[PDB]
């Protein structure tokens, strides 16, 4: 579990979104596994605007942060689940890093701010849904 709070927005994995997220929907994209809902309280997370390929992510299954090198956002094949059929997930970045089911939602950050959230992995890999291209999160 986990979310990004920036301005009047909450960014979560689309497969983990709640009834409240869907009743206050701003934008969602099944191909990115993202959903953004509106909030009453003001969020203070800073979104990174960069092409960093190094950062640190929070891994709940180890209660630890890990430094990682990660790939550029791209279309990557993802296995079927109770939430999606087998498909290409867009704007996904992979790193060699552990992860298990509930790790979805952990933040990846670089020196500039929030880069994205854990959305994939499996077999010793973890993937991140990138949010750096969503320029409207700041306004
Ligand atoms: C880092 O995520 C994982 C962690 C562990 C596992 C494992 F292999 F153990 F079952 C799997 C994953 N994945 C990849 C995963 O949870 N899903 C399931 C829900 C939908 C997510 C999506 N973006 O489509 C993909
Ligand atoms: Zn950066």
Question: Could you tell me if the CB of 92 is within 6 A of ligand 1?
Answer: no
Phi, psi of 71 (to 5 degrees): -75, 175
Domain boundaries along the sequence of the chain: 3-44, 45-139
Phi, psi of 52 (to 5 degrees): -55, 140
3-state secondary structure of 85: coil
Helix (H) or strand (E) holding 23: helix 19-23
Selection from 3, 95, 13 nearest residue 56 by Cα: 95
Question: Could you tell me if the CB of 117 is within 6 A of ligand 1?
Answer: no
H and E: helices and strands count for the chain: 1, 10
Q: Which are the contacts of 123, defined by CB distance < 8 A and separation ≥ 6? A: none
Annotated binding site for Zn(2+): 50, 52, 110, 112
Question: Could you tell me if the CB of 95 is within 6 A of ligand 1?
Answer: no
Q: Contact at 8 Å (CB) between 95 and 68?
A: yes
Phi, psi of 42 (to 5 degrees): -85, 125
Which experiment gave this structure? X-ray
Selection from 70, 129, 132, 128 nearest residue 99 by Cα: 128
Q: What Å resolution does this PDB entry report?
A: 1.5
């Amino acid at each position: 579990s986990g979310a990004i709070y920036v301005g009047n927005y909450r960014v979560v994995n689309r497969h983990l979104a709640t009834h409240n997220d869907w009743a206050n929907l701003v934008w969602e994209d099944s191909s990115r596994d993202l959903l953004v809902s509106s909030t009453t309280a003001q969020g203070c997370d800073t979104i990174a605007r960069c092409d960093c390929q190094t950062g640190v992510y929070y891994c709940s299954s180890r209660r630890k942060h890990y430094p990682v090198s990660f790939s550029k956002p791209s279309l990557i094949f993802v296995e079927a689940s109770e939430y999606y059929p087998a498909r290409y997930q867009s704007h996904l970045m992979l790193a060699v890093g552990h992860s298990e089911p509930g790790d979805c939602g952990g933040i990846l950050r670089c020196q500039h701010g929030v880069v994205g959230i854990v959305s994939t992995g499996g077999n010793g890999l973890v993937g991140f849904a990138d949010v750096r291209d969503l320029l409207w999160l700041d306004e």
